[PDB]
Symmetry: D2
Subunit: 115 residues, 4 copies
């Protein structure tokens, strides 16, 4: 599993379940092409987005639909989505965990990259 | 000043100085049109981006060039940029501070929205 | 003002107002003796805690009463308080801002140390 | 496993390995009594601190030795340690994950609490 996303809720102290996200990859003409999508499970994790062979070098964007998550809890949040943009596999294959910790007016994001 | 951006450095414990950013407004065709830009001051702040009359309701994106900031310090970063995407909404007189706290492999962002 | 504390609310997107805190200095017997205290202003800031002559090198603890803050808003919090423990070190003229960003089940803290 | 701690490094984008921590429990006389201790593994996780039977209701403090972690990487950090203080099991047994994301001048901490 070369790309995994984990989302947590800082209001409830829980995984953020059923959070939709779309992953894009920058094409040679500089447009964002669709790459993969899914939603977080009961553990707040989304696995199985891609494979080692498909996940080539490139610039990737993870767009996490945080607005819909908060609205369903009755909260009108500040952000439209959380966006994570990064170059992947520039020095050979790596495994990436993208994580986001969500509050209505704030989020933190980090990456855990392993060889 | 209806919109201000403040950027801090979590490695050095300091304002993040000379950080470039662009602000975009989402257009009717879902493209991002440039709206304002600048570099943070010695206090890590960027003022004077817009005026009350120009800053109408809509979806805005602040793209902060965090990669160039870390490269200037000789530190390898994860993100291509930090992206803050939000809806501006008219409910009473409001001033928006977008703040970002930067680390090489992580960032936190919040909004301080006041009257 | 050699020491200032700023507290923000990540649920409401606002300064955290009327947040009580105590500052302690570590004594020779490893106990915490009271040093200063106050409540945050409408800007979420607490100024005037100490003076340059009083704020000598040593280990200091800021204990922020985040539990009472969340209880006043009717939101169940995780932490008893937020604790920030640091060493003050003399290397040139330095001013310390301790900042805390609060959510019910999470907090972030940073230091902005300037000349 | 009713109490687990996970520590990540926001500079390197990696687990924080070999981070020492001590857990204390508030006694009836209001002193902090030693409860458990350990260090994080190669995954940045510390498991096996306690058992369901030993982990009774109370106020617990996790003291994470972040200063030694940074010093061994050549970094002189701001904080002496990260302190996480919380009431546990007040409504019956729960499983707690305490997490900390570390930078030299900043850290974020959250909790994931499950029934
Ligand atoms: C994401 C940016 C951020 O991180 C924080 C944190 F981790 C703890 C406390 C904080 F206030 C913040 C903070 C801020 O928004 C911020 C900091 C200062 I100094 C300000 O003067 C203003 I206005 C805003
Ligand atoms: C931005 C997301 C985030 O915030 C953190 C924080 F504030 C403190 C400590 C942290 F580990 C994190 C964290 C994580 O990356 C994370 C949390 C868990 I639980 C995991 O199992 C995995 I894999 C990753």
């Amino acid at each position: 599993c070369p790309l995994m996303v984990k989302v947590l809720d800082a209001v409830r102290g829980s995984p953020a379940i059923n959070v939709a996200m779309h992953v894009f990859r920058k094409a040679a003409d500089d447009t964002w092409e669709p790459f993969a999508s899914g939603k977080t499970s009961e553990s707040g994790e989304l696995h199985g987005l891609t494979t080692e062979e498909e996940f080539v070098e490139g610039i990737y964007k993870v767009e996490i639909d945080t607005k819909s998550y908060w609205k369903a809890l009755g909260i009108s949040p500040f952000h439209e989505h959380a966006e994570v943009v990064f170059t992947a596999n520039d020095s050979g294959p790596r495994r990436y965990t993208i994580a986001a910790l969500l509050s209505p007016y704030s989020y933190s994001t980090t990456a855990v990259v392993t060889n």
